[PDB]
Amino acid sequence: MDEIITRWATDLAKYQKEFKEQAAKVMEWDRLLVENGEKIQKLYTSTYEAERASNEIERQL
């Protein structure tokens, strides 16, 4: 009956070692997401600025 416990424990360790990797990958992805998000916001600001400036030039002409 040990041959079953062996399978259980091997499967356990095997899939643990993989779950850790998956989680890690997800974490890295989150980091990527926020890291870009900051830049997106920067783009929002820069864009709004551009918009206002263009409106001003429109007013000038």
Partner 1 sequence: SEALQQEIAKIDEEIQKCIRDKEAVDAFLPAHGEQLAAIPTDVNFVTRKSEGAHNA
Partner 2 sequence: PIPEQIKLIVDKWNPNHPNCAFKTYLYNKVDEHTVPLYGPGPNEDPKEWEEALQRKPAPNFIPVLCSGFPSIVARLMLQRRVITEFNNKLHQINASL
Partner 3 sequence: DEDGLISLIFNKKESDIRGQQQQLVESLHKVLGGHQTLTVNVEGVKTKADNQTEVIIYVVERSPNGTSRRVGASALFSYFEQAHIKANMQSLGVTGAMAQTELSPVQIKQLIQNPL
Rounded CA gap, 14 and 20, in Å?
Answer: 10
Q: Which residue has the tokens 């062996």?
A: 6
Which of 3/35 has CB closer to partner 3?
35
Separation between Cα atoms, residue 61 and residue 59, nearest integer Å: 6
Residue 57 interacts with partner 2 (CB under 8 A)? no
Stretch 9-38: interaction string toward partner 1, x if CB under 8 A: --x---x--xx--x--x---x--xx--x--
Contact residues for partner 3, defined by CB under 8 A: 30, 33-34, 37, 41
